Structure formats: structure tokens, C-alpha cells
Design an enzyme around this catalytic site. Structure first.
Site, mmCIF file in Angstrom:
data_model
loop_
_atom_site.group_PDB
_atom_site.id
_atom_site.type_symbol
_atom_site.label_atom_id
_atom_site.label_comp_id
_atom_site.label_asym_id
_atom_site.label_seq_id
_atom_site.Cartn_x
_atom_site.Cartn_y
_atom_site.Cartn_z
ATOM 1 N N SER A 81 -0.117 -8.861 -5.313
ATOM 2 C CA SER A 81 -0.699 -10.180 -5.563
ATOM 3 C C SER A 81 -1.589 -10.620 -4.407
ATOM 4 C CB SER A 81 0.402 -11.225 -5.752
ATOM 5 O OG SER A 81 1.204 -10.889 -6.892
ATOM 6 N N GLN B 34 3.496 -6.890 -7.554
ATOM 7 C CA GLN B 34 3.097 -7.121 -8.945
ATOM 8 C C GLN B 34 2.490 -5.856 -9.555
ATOM 9 O OE1 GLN B 34 0.316 -9.800 -11.880
ATOM 10 N NE2 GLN B 34 0.625 -10.674 -9.845
ATOM 11 N N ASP C 20 13.972 -6.817 1.415
ATOM 12 C CA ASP C 20 12.849 -7.212 0.582
ATOM 13 C C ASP C 20 13.521 -7.764 -0.657
ATOM 14 O OD1 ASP C 20 10.581 -7.566 -1.049
ATOM 15 O OD2 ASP C 20 9.896 -5.552 -0.914
ATOM 16 N N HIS D 116 8.844 -7.373 2.738
ATOM 17 C CA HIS D 116 7.958 -7.090 1.614
ATOM 18 C C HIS D 116 6.580 -6.645 2.113
ATOM 19 C CE1 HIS D 116 6.762 -7.138 -2.558
ATOM 20 N NE2 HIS D 116 5.904 -8.109 -2.363
#
EC number: 3.1.1.74
Length: 197
Positions: free
Chosen positions: A26, A105, A159, A172
Site C-alpha cells: 500500500s 496488500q 508483524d 512490517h
């Protein structure tokens, strides 16, 4: 660097042997984002610049943060775009071996696209790498309808997206080492397992 459209731009009379389709995370730029260029450079080292085509998922995939909350972890428009690229690879270069990947994503997008793919094209994807896989807990570390031995998931301790949440914490953002070494290593090994050399 962050945009590669080798499959769209490539000549069908001189198909590469390996085609890599990658979806970014993202809010990332171009169609490869932060991790895709590292993976791409190591694939070009292994197979040569004419030997592999690097293709990011652009077009309708906007990598909008809010779409992580939708049912499949991304939008239907983004899934249609990635399915369209797998179908273009299959038409343009029927003998090429495919490999795929995605981050965050983009990892949910890669899993949803592969799940929906025609099995005859899905079976040409020799290996898939997923980083910060947002559907890791929900899918039990697998891509639906795709073999576990062809899948590699990189999910860091801490994460939170790997453990069923959509909170973004520091682990992350720490997949750079994996994109530089074990993720291209796994993809190269899976391509050589079926193509020899």
C-alpha cells in the site's frame, strides 16, 4: 527501478524464458514499490536481462491502504488487473515459466489472483513469494488452490498483519534483507527445478 513493464512492452517473437509478476504494498510508488527492484536485479543476474521479464501490477491496482479491509484484502478491480497480466503472459509467451510475488496488500492480491486463475495458467507459476502476508493467519500460510511446496511466506515476528490484524508496526517495514537474498534464492531454485539449466 520502480516501474517495470517488460511483459506489456516485450516482443512476442522474443519471449523471455521466465516472467515475474509482482504486486507492491500500500501507498508504494511505481508498480514495484520498495522490495520489487531488489528481487528483479537478482533475477536478472541469474537468468540474464534477456532471460527474464519483470512486470509489476500497475493499471487499476492503486495500492490504496483502505482496501486492505475489503473481503479479499484488496479490491476486485486490482484482482482483475493481476489476472489480466497472468492471462497476457500465457498468451504472449506460452512456453515461459512464471513466478510471482507480492508485499502486504500486494501479497493478498497475489493470493486472490492465483486462487481465481484458470488452473492451466496457475500450474505454470513455479514459485510465489509473499512478504508481510495480510491473509497469513486466515489462509493458514497458504495460497488457496496452490501447492505449499511452491509457496514461501516471509512473515516477521511482531508483524501484526501476519497474525490477523491490520495494524502496521515496525517489523512490517523490515523485509529488505529477505528481498535481497532468500526470496530471489527461492524463486531461482523453483525455476531451475522445472527448467533444469
Amino acid at each position: 527501478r520502480t516501474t517495470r513493464d517488460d511483459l506489456i512492452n516485450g516482443n512476442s517473437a522474443s519471449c523471455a524464458d521466465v516472467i515475474f509478476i509482482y504486486a507492491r504494498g500500500s501507498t508504494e510508488t511505481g508498480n514495484l514499490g520498495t522490495l520489487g527492484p531488489s528481487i528483479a536485479s537478482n533475477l536478472e543476474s541469474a537468468f540474464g536481462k534477456d532471460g527474464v521479464w519483470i512486470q509489476g501490477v500497475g493499471g487499476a491496482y492503486r495500492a490504496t491502504l483502505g482496501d486492505n479491509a475489503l473481503p479479499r484484502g484488496t479490491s476486485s478491480a486490482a484482482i482483475r488487473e493481476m489476472l489480466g497480466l497472468f492471462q497476457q503472459a500465457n498468451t504472449k509467451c506460452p512456453d515461459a515459466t512464471l513466478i510471482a510475488g507480492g508485499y502486504s496488500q500486494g501479497a493478498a492480491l497475489a493470493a486472490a489472483s492465483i486462487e481465481d486463475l484458470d488452473s492451466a495458467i496457475r500450474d505454470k507459476i513455479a514459485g510465489t513469494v509473499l512478504f508481510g502476508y495480510t491473509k497469513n493467519l486466515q489462509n493458514r500460510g497458504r495460497i488457496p488452490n496452490y501447492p505449499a511446496d511452491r509457496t514461501k511466506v516471509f512473515c516477521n515476528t511482531g508483524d501484526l498483519v501476519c497474525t490477523g490484524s491490520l495494524i502496521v508496526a515496525a517489523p512490517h517495514l523490515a523485509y529488505g534483507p529477505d528481498a535481497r537474498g532468500p526470496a530471489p534464492e527461492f524463486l531461482i531454485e523453483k525455476v531451475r527445478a522445472v527448467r533444469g539449466s
